[PDB]
Amino acid sequence: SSSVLSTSGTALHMAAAAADLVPNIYGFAVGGSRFGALFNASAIGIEISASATRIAADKISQSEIYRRRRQEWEIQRNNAEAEIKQIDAQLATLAVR
């Protein structure tokens, strides 16, 4: 949800840049508008995109470390099942003795 929701701000930053290009002031002073607003919005959209794919990498890393934890538990379960079979057969040979 974080990786999806973080990418929805580039349209708003671009809209802020498009809204702040028209001249604010009027009258005897003709108008003041920041011209680099589009470049600043594109740069901040690139940065928020980099943050979004960073947290996507964190998400996939968490998924894979959970998968490896499950595989290790599978190893432990197979070892314990072999162990309980071995002790059962040792009980059998103890009954024979």
Binding site: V4, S8, A15, A18, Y26, G27
Partner: protein, 610 residues
């Protein structure tokens, strides 16, 4: 067996954590609650944080809506509400009219409020939604007032700008598309009047119609208001609108225009009719595919309830007393065509598709719903059925959803005789319980708190006779109808119930609007499988006593020289069909857990403690 057990015992499968359709505040509470350690202080702080969002969702107020279809009882309305904050933040929800089986919506029909993310700064709340190509578009105006307010270099620059945004499939909102409209708005503003806003979507032409009008107290179909027309393409390029097409549009939908006193909801724009049909329909017999089609459909309404259809049917057999066209009504054969007769330029066998192109088919039908069927019969047993549904846009005032705002704080939507609450005053009473204690908000006293009653209104309890196969008939129900509400003074199917054993009562809310109640006020009779009532004072006539500011049952006794709203009438009988009818004297109707905010109330009072 798991599916059948989920049908029979759903109690085994409900977990209190996940649920299909749980809200964003519920999910945020679950994020705030999912730890290894949960103290009492931690869970109470999380509950207060949930209560804040619940309060902010309960404190919404509907601005305006847009019914999707032509008729009210078919499509689904999209409402828009705002929050009580200085950066006023807007929401939208969706309510279906297919679910209201008789006038009243179930809680299944109401969708969740969904916050829109594009920040919107409206000028004088001129903001409408519009469903265009089944996509939620949003329209509003912004103003930029820059006044010097002096004499030396007095500069008065005001700029009005139309903005357009549509939703995406992933819930995100598009960038707003700017449109300079300040010349037309200054034309409507130099003539000093309140500026209205019509926003709808044509479907014949694929544009959206936006015209701003002045606000009169009545639009009388011949005194057209001052208007400024505009239209937007499917692409966000803007198109011009000539004054003749603008006058045709205003004459088409003057009825859906907001007056100075009552807010309307724009429906889908339609001039006279709408032809719902498909062009080409294939069959693909193993001999040959056929794919008969209707090419150039055109219909002109000559008057009110009539039509003049015109189209050029064809058949496209690709690899006599053979193939025949047939245009029918439900039972009337209107146009019957053949291949040997009236087919210009019969196609040669050297063409691999054989296109026929019969002639231009003209017909004149009357009525409001014309489900025509075009048939392409081949036999010697191959029929190509092609339906055409033509539906008239009813121009009644009942075909317009009206929403209101009581000064007590409630906000109801009224569709004719029916009214539906959209707001609540629960957050205004919630804080006194919440600052006292968390036990107090989850008490049953907080659930048994009253609410206002959606306009002026009154109630009436109708005690009913037992069912005994006579005086009722056979089918064992009752239809409490109504009369004399609108300018229409006739029998309308207000409420229906199933007739039962020895005693059954029903409390019905009956509104009042002071432009209502045409003759002797509202009458209210019973229906049956046998002969129904309401013939010359058989029903229950009520009227609003303006003097005592209360509602008077007039059909109480067999009164002589009794007062109605028209005046003193001579001979009044008793109400028949019922057993006891009386005014219910300020009922409560506490919280409406089957209402619009039923999901939020259920999530607060059951799902959150679970």
């Amino acid at each position: 067996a798991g599916v059948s057990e989920l049908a029979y015992y759903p109690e085994n499968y409900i977990d209190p954590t996940i649920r299909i359709g749980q809200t964003g505040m519920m999910n945020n509470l679950l994020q705030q609650l999912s730890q290894s350690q949960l103290n009492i202080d931690t869970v109470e702080d999380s509950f207060k944080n949930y209560l804040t969002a619940f309060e902010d969702v309960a404190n919404l107020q509907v601005i305006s809506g847009y019914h999707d279809s032509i008729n009210v009882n078919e499509g689904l309305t999209y409402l828009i509400g705002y929050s009580q904050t200085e950066p006023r933040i807007y929401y939208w929800r969706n309510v279906d009219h297919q679910k209201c089986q008789h006038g009243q919506f179930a809680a299944n029909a109401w969708g969740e409020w969904k916050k829109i993310e594009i920040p919107i700064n409206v000028w004088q709340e001129n903001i409408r939604p519009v469903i265009y190509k089944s996509r939620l578009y949003l329209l509003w105006l912004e103003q930029k007032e820059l006044k010097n307010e002096s004499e030396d270099g007095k500069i008065d620059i005001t700029d009005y700008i139309l903005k357009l945004s549509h939703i995406r499939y992933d819930g995100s909102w598009s960038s707003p598309f700017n449109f300079n409209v300040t010349d037309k708005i200054e034309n409507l503003i130099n003539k000093k009047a309140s500026i209205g806003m019509y926003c709808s979507s044509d479907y014949e032409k694929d544009v959206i119609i936006v015209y701003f009008h002045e606000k009169k107290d009545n639009y009388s179909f011949n005194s057209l208001p001052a208007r400024e027309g505009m239209t937007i393409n499917p692409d966000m390029t803007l198109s011009i609108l000539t004054e003749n097409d603008l006058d045709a549009i205003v004459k088409s939908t003057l009825s859906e225009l907001d007056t100075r006193t009552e807010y309307k909801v724009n429906n889908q724009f339609a001039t006279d009719y709408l032809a719902e049909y498909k062009e080409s329909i294939t069959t693909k017999n193993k001999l040959a595919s056929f794919t008969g089609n209707i090419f150039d459909l055109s219909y002109i309404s000559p008057g009110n309830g009539h039509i003049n259809l015109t189209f050029n049917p064809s058949m496209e057999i690709n690899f006599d007393k053979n193939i025949s066209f047939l245009l029918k009504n439900g039972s009337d054969i209107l146009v019957e065509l053949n291949a040997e007769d009236h087919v210009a330029s019969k196609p040669s066998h050297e063409s691999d598709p054989m296109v026929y192109d019969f002639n231009q088919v003209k017909v004149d039908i009357e009525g409001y719903d014309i489900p025509l069927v075009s048939e392409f019969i081949i036999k010697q047993d191959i029929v190509i059925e092609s339906p055409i549904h033509i539906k008239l846009k009813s121009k009644d005032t009942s075909n317009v959803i009206s929403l209101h705002k009581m000064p007590s704080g409630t906000q109801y939507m009224q569709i004719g005789p029916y009214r539906t609450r959209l707001n609540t005053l629960f957050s205004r009473k919630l804080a006194e319980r919440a600052n006292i204690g968390i036990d107090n908000v989850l008490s049953m006293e907080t659930q048994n708190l009253p609410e206002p009653q959606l306009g002026e209104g009154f109630y009436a309890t109708f005690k009913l006779p037992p069912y005994n196969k006579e005086e009722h008939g056979d089918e064992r129900w009752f239809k409490i109808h109504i009369g004399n509400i609108d300018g229409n003074s006739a029998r309308q199917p207000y409420y229906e119930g199933m007739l039962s054993d020895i005693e059954t009562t029903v409390t019905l809310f009956v509104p009042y609007a002071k432009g209502y109640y045409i003759r002797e006020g509202v009458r209210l009779g019973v229906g049956y499988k046998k002969i129904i009532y309401d013939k010359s004072w058989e029903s229950a006539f009520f009227y609003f006593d303006e003097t005592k500011n209360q509602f008077i049952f007039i059909n109480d006794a067999d009164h002589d020289s009794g007062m109605t709203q028209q005046g003193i009438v001579k001979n009044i009988k008793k109400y028949k069909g019922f057993i006891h009818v009386v005014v219910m004297k300020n009922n409560t109707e506490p919280m409406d857990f089957n209402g619009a905010n039923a999901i939020y109330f259920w999530e607060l009072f059951y799902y959150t403690p679970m």
